[PDB]
């Protein structure tokens, strides 16, 4: 119950540490993704179609997606050590549970860093995105919002399912 002893490992291409641990570990990765996510929600609280207010948080939104994409690669690099740990069991069988959920966590975060990199070749020029055009299904600005805010909850996908098989995938060893 409750015993910390993360040491020893320190670059692995995976992690090692107790399987109580490592719950609380993803659990406050979900909540800083969330809190990230929620930075971005507070920018656009409204349509691209208000020139004034998008003018006025130009800088700070790309704070916000930097924020995003930073709690989600730092989520990945953490879920990936678990999935590669995965690799070790018997079954095998959770092993492709637990990644083809995380293909779509990283589905989102490449076309997120599609958008948010083409916007800054654009240099967030206000002429390209608070001037934008109504019909627009490259609404790459825009997917970026929508794709944003779903992916803390597909990444509780995989919060969950690794929380839930930490017993079966970290082992602290024999307890008799």
């Known amino acids: 119950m409750g015993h910390h002893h993360h040491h020893h490992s320190h670059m692995d291409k995976r992690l090692f540490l107790d399987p109580d641990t490592a719950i609380e570990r993803l659990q406050r990765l979900q909540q800083a993704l969330e809190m990230g996510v929620s930075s971005l929600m507070a920018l656009v609280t409204t ?7 998008m003018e006025r948080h130009i800088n700070e939104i790309r704070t916000a997606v930097d924020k995003v994409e930073l709690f989600l690669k730092e989520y990945l690099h953490f879920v990936k050590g678990a999935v590669a740990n995965a690799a ?3 079954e095998l069988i959770l092993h492709n549970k637990m990644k083809r ?6 589905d989102s975060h490449q076309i997120l860093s599609q958008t948010s990199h083409d916007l800054n070749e654009c240099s967030w020029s206000l002429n390209i995105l608070a001037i934008n055009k109504p019909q627009n299904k490259c609404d790459d600005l825009d997917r970026f ?3 944003a805010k779903t992916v803390p909850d597909d990444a509780k996908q995989l919060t969950t399912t690794i929380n839930t098989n930490a017993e079966a995938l970290f082992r602290p060893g024999p307890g008799s």
Not at 47 to 53: I, L, N, P, S, V
């Open 47 to 53: 349509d691209w179609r208000c020139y004034g207010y």
């Open 88 to 90: 070790c069991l018997p």
């Open 101 to 106: 959920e995380l293909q779509r966590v990283e």
């Open 145 to 147: 919002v929508m794709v």
